[PDB]
Amino acid sequence: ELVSAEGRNRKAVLCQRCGSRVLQPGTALFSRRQLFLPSMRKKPDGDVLEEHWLVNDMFIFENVGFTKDVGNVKFLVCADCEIGPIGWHCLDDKNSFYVALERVSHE
Ligand SMILES: [Zn+2]
């Protein structure tokens, strides 16, 4: 109901806390890569997730925030309410941004 025949997101991706629109439908690819994401918290413990929306560029995002670059890694957070991490990003791989399905909502 969420992944298309082409493997894209059939529905819009949004923040589960405030409803902020993170991604428009059909702009990301489903990915089963294992990534550890600290438990959801305010911007300033976790889970190894294996279901993500793979985004090619941060410009593709509708609304999204990034944490202070630490260890070549930046966590994605809701741009509006700032709760996260809803995603993950390794700076070495400029064109790979991941948004964990469990950490977001869909409409
Ligand atoms: Zn939010």
Side-chain angles (χ1 to χ4, degrees), residues 1-5 7-9 11-31 33-41 43-44 46-55 58 60-67 69 71 73-94 96-107:
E1 187 68 35
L2 294 186
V3 188
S4 77
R8 313 297 292 235
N9 59 304
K11 301 176 69 180
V13 184
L14 41 146
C15 169
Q16 54 176 244
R17 304 299 190 85
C18 75
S20 177
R21 176 64 57 100
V22 182
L23 289 162
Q24 291 290 312
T27 57
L29 289 158
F30 181 72
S31 173
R33 180 178 176 193
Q34 289 188 16
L35 299 170
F36 177 79
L37 298 193
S39 63
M40 292 284 261
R41 59 198 71 181
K43 208 172 183 178
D47 309 296
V48 172
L49 304 176
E50 301 181 283
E51 292 185 316
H52 309 98
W53 291 123
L54 213 207
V55 188
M58 58 169 94
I60 291 172
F61 285 106
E62 195 59 34
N63 298 107
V64 71
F66 300 82
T67 64
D69 169 7
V73 175
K74 275 182 186 172
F75 290 114
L76 313 193
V77 305
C78 175
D80 301 324
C81 72
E82 297 187 335
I83 293 300
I86 62 171
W88 183 94
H89 170 75
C90 180
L91 305 169
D92 292 343
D93 302 311
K94 306 292 178 60
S96 291
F97 298 83
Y98 303 80
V99 177
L101 274 71
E102 270 185 32
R103 300 301 180 80
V104 301
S105 292
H106 303 80
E107 274 190 356

